[PDB]
């Protein structure tokens, strides 16, 4: 049968009424706070533990209520800052500048108030993974952990380094009044002009007037960040940046900050045979252009890698082309013939996104964002940016033209937007990518998919009569290797160098003695002229001098290769990975959106495991993508020396 | 999520149907006497304690029937005994005396038989608190816990000192044939005559005469009082008295015997600053009367306190009046001018009770009680006493004359009788107050309200143009302090003295030395002639000789002040507490009657908490009542020593 | 007041909704499997034991199914086994001999297999007393708890002594070929011939041929009987037998094996004065018969008691009759006067058994059982046995003749089967007596009632004119004392002797000497010829050699006395207890049937309490039964010295 639970006022009433209480009927005493079970000819007291007072809101619940209230206020405040940011970037005016000051101060003050209001909430007793992740992402004091003077000094130094890099100007000895900046002056000169002396001077002059100036600033920046990290229970500032990839609280998915370093080391070792052959071929081709400036046995000059830091070897493609008479993959004729426009490019990207199974895109983007150049009466930023303004607002700000590149950037910005629309369901704190290499990877794979000849043929960009030969595939593989695989050692060595310089393993009087020697050995990049310790060459880059973790580029490339291979596997495509296309593949879009919606609500390991199939960052897709390149690279370097000599330098 | 509790005969159908049992459904098994909770994929055995036997034809019902039978027979027997007592009080004749002997013997024999017949009824298996308390009162064997000879000699000694106290006579040394009794000779001598010689001689001669013949008797009485208290599971006879205040088995209101001791001590310690100032002023007035008989730092003489044992300082109010030029408040002259008798005393008094919300009081009292001296045909005792005969019969014995003081006494007696009929619904055992300080407090609270000029003005006793300035307020407050507050230290020390005299910590050769040390240090009064252990001065009081608890008076004062303050708070009175009146406030009467009807069934702490809100003892209303007096005493004691010194004595 | 149980998926929802949970409503969460009770201002956690993995198949269910399956099949196998034994017992034939050989083999193998199956059903987790008790009987391995060789040799030694006792023959020295078996060649000559020499020679020869031969066999039998007793968790084989009387787990009726020894000793000690008077008078009559062979103070001869073991003094009733001239009570000649046979004896037995109120029994037993020897064509056994063949089949083996002795044994036999089918509702294992001293007691009590002169007169066995004087009552009482009370000391001591023989307290070189020492001090009987430890006189008993506990007879005597006293109390018998008759008393049969139906399921101590009113056994009925004889023995002991002497011997 079935029985209920009885309750009376006094124990005397319980005794007088327990006679008619059937067996199995629980008796609860409000006066005595006791529990009894009606047994045969009696009632047995049920043991009860210590009194537990009613919590109006547990400490976990108090954090939940605070986080919800903060997120609700953050959505409006961030949207106001985002729209003010949009207005400034559409038109740069004095009124536009001042509302950055107001929005920035208001957002920072609100963030500081909530972070202080969140710091008392303990993360140990909260078992809610989403709530704990929100609190730790909100409790990051950062520079505020130190004193006011120390925090202000660090911010002022950081602004100084950014200002020096941005306004770094070099004047030629022939005309001291004539001076040029790094961009677009030094970058274009060292990417197109083939003069060794001009490139060498610009490389040396910039690293002199920037390195010498930044050397005390970067050194004080390093120590201030290191001491801030110590105050934040971090071994160094590199450990602070690796904390984004750090995962805790999830069984089977925990990731430590040291695991990221060892995976980067392991992946670089895997790419080392492929990069060595790529470097050897690029080295060999430079003798074909300049036989009396570089030696095949030695390394390659930093300024002769197509840029100053050796970031991109794409500028060396004209100097390293295997078959210059073979035309590259370019469909610019289709643009002019059919009068293609930027709005049409985005419309085709949306249509392609519909084809791959992903849903449509909001019309508020079209009515609030510009694609072409917005006339000339106003100044607008033409840099490719995708905007997540919050509360459903998604925009893109760039002077998009009608070039294959722009068609890829449009796809890239759509890929950024798709991520922004995807984790939008997650709370404001969790309404972002799991790490800094996910949002860029989605845009990159979208650009890679949009650049495939099959996708162009499907939408008519590529002529149906176009043929696919070995030379075109080899040149495309080399071009991708220079652009992406070429920058992998650059990201690998720069982030590594920043790691032990923050760890304090590099003595001050030997800084450049390590970087320039390590550059020659691990990567085989050699400085054209010697630099003493007064130089600050590693900090001459934008990201390092602007408080940016450079491990994003290596992680995003590792993710983008894994995503592309996983999409190809889900799209049952037949053919080489470089020719693989995800067009008309609903499996690819659905699989991609499975991790896209997660954002940072789940650990990045779970997001990665969702598509490729594992939490590791193995470069197997990279080897498979460039296996025909690797065999061709081995064929080209079958007689050419492979590797690099640490001893050799251009000045020696 | 809703469920209940299931049951089954045995474990065979239990585990054959546990699969069909939904999760969260509690299960009781009669065969195994076990409890289980159906959890997700399992069941957890609920811990069960020993089975409590169900109520049956046990001692519970047998005692309840015995209690009902006892109450029925005690109602008639007590009615007959109280009828005989009133008749003897109305008419003192030889036939009335024989009635007392017969009624007293039968009542005592009946009580002891009920006590014996309830002795083998244990309370361990009885859970009814009302029955438990009633049967405990029945099981109050008393001195019969010892041998009969010990009880007989203790009663014989008690009657010896009580008779000696009544007949205690001192003779003038020059006139031996003329002797003055304590009642009313010595009392009147120290109440009216201010002569130091006469008061000292009467004080010394009485204590010597009483002490030299009662000291061995008091010692044996104390030893015997210790003997049957130890046999009654008490450390002394003090714990035997404190058992009435002790509360057990009631959650949130349990009281210990030592708790009242510490509460009384703490209340006196905070009272001490007010008492020291009052003692300072009375000492200052003693300098005004007899400059050479009181020291500025010394303690007051024992015989110069206005009464016999220094209890009440009302007789000193004439010599210690704050302003003797101000005439005292007295409506007796107006009352006699209005042709009002003792019948009008109770008639206007009954108007007061129906004014405060208390209902009409039965006409049986009016036809069964006298308000005047019944001439000289039948001798009547004029002592104030209220009688609850039973069966709805209620009487009050007092020679109520047409005076202001008898008006208060008439107010007190019917305050007793109104408490008597308040808990008439309670059984015979429960027909009593929770302690000995409640009935007197009830008769005191409304007496003070009646003595207030507002009540006299409302009933026409006082002229509407009566002036109430600060001088008459201070005089009234000081008179109240002398009559009530002045005796509070004496009540505390004497009860404390009698408490340790039962405990035996103070040796029999130090009873008088400790008594005078307490008198000097606590009371601030020093004897005019030193007394050795031959003197038995504490036993010279009526209460000590007749075995009467003295903590009842101090507790009653604390009770009456708390009761009055709550009544004033309930009546929404604004102004000084001494001017507070409860007339035309029906809420106060109804609220007061809520615990008056409760009787002694509930703990006295619960009753005190219900009245004001303080579960424990408090003296907060004392400060509110005498705040103008305390400020006046502090103002007037700036030029005089505050406190006392034990070193000084009138004899040294 | 009523309430229920509430559930929540997670504790977060529980905390939010705990405010809406009324007091008395239980809160359960499946995530933590935690139970809480809603209390005043909070929730109290309910203590829960370890979570079981839903064991829907308990051992209790499996054991109950196994027991029911076993009982159903065991009934058939035992039934056909009982048929074959009855066929052999009614017709001894070679084909019959192999019938029990096959039937016993199958039954034994079946029993050991079910015992083996019950071995994996431990009793700790079984809560049903009936299931636990039945499986305990099933799990009784007995001889198979040891190794096979120990069991095989124990059986072989058991067979050897059983054969030796059966074939125990002694030959006269003058006639080597003239030899007499113990039954009936030896027993007849000693019980009929009173010659001291012939009885002494037969006693000596029997103990020389059998005692010497069985001494090593008995010692080896005892050693092995101690071996599996400790393997069965018993300190000795005596404790193994005492385990049947042990009651465990029954609160208020638990019995221990040691308690049986203490109570048996206590009963014997208080019985001793009555036995000493009987032994003194029997000795006194022995000097009357043989003055030069028995001392007035010494113990009785072993061979001069009517039994070579000294069991029964019934053969001495003629030699020790209180009055040899008064005729004895016997109505056998009246049966042949009325032309009665064994059929009429049983028919009258049923009429008596239905006059006591118990229902008539079926006709199957009458047509399936013989009451007379089946001629001489087929050989049959005439020993008094009861056949509990099962399946509602009950039979009696008796060659009943038309005699009072056969009349009483016929009453004894039908009482046995009337006990058997009374508890037919019990399962096959529980279809047995509570102890070994109950089945014989049931047949004894009413057979004595049938033998009462009132019963004989009621149904016409004895003429109504028969006079009932004290002389016949004393003669009847003495015969009862010789047959029943006389065997009590021998029964108690021999079981006491065999108990410590298994225990090993008395060494092997003292057993028989301790027996004879106990025969003198306790039994009061002395051996006529001294022997050595080669003699094994206690092992000459049938029960010792055939592995039968001897405590059954002493317990049955006190059990039957208690049963008879309760029968007389229920029948409200007035006068001497030996003349009490239960005939024509329906209430007495109903009270007996209250435990007859109970069977062995309940503890025998509870059954004894239900009959009389005492949980423990007592000798009170013995005093009431033999009070006239006890006074007669006391009066006639003017020359009969109370007790005996250990020093005197027939040979010394």
Numbering used by the authors:
A (entry chain E), B (entry chain C), C (entry chain A): -37 to 614
Paper quotes:
We describe the development of a biologic that takes advantage of the proximity of the N-terminus of bound ACE2 to the three-fold symmetry axis of the spike protein to create an ultrapotent, trivalent ACE2 entry antagonist. Therefore, we sought trimeric scaffolds to fuse three ACE2 moieties and leverage the inherent symmetry of the spike trimer to maximize avidity. Thus, we determined a trimeric antagonist fused to the N-terminus of ACE2 would require a short peptide linker and would be less likely to form inter-spike interactions. The collagen VIII trimerization domain is significantly larger than the collagen XVIII domain (44.7 kDa and 19.3 kDa, respectively), but more importantly, previous studies reported that collagen VIII melts at ~45 °C66, whereas the collagen XVIII domain melts at ~85 °C (vide infra). Given these observations, the smaller, more thermally stable collagen XVIII trimerization domain was advanced to develop the trimeric antagonist.
Next, variable lengths of glycine-serine peptide linkers (0, 1, 3, 5, 18 amino acids) were tested to bridge the trimerization domain and ACE2 domains. To simplify the nomenclature, we refer to these constructs as TXA, where ‘T’ indicates the collagen XVIII trimerization domain, ‘X’ refers to the number of residues in the linker, and ‘A’ refers to ACE2. Analysis of the other complexes, both with longer (5 and 18 amino acids) and shorter (“zero” amino acids) linker lengths, was conducted to better understand the role of the linker with respect to the symmetry of the trimeric antagonist. Notably, we did not observe discernible density for the collagen XVIII trimerization domains of the longer linker length constructs (T5A or T18A), whereas we did observe clear density connecting the trimerization domain and ACE2 in the zero-linker length, T0A. Further, although the axis of symmetry through the modeled trimerization domain of T0A was nearly parallel to the spike C3 symmetry axis, it was off-center. We then attempted to evaluate the ‘symmetry of interaction’ between our ACE2 constructs with spike protein (T0A-S, T3A-S, T5A-S, and T18A-S; where S is the SARS-CoV-2 spike HexaPro protein) by likening the C3 symmetry to an equilateral triangle with all sides being equal length and a corresponding standard deviation between these lengths of zero (s.d. = 0). Thus, we calculated lengths (distances) and corresponding standard deviations between the Cα atoms of equivalent residues in the RBDs of the spike protein (residue D428; as determined by Fan et al.) and in each of the ACE2 domains (residue N137; arbitrarily determined residue on ACE2) (red and black dashed lines, respectively).
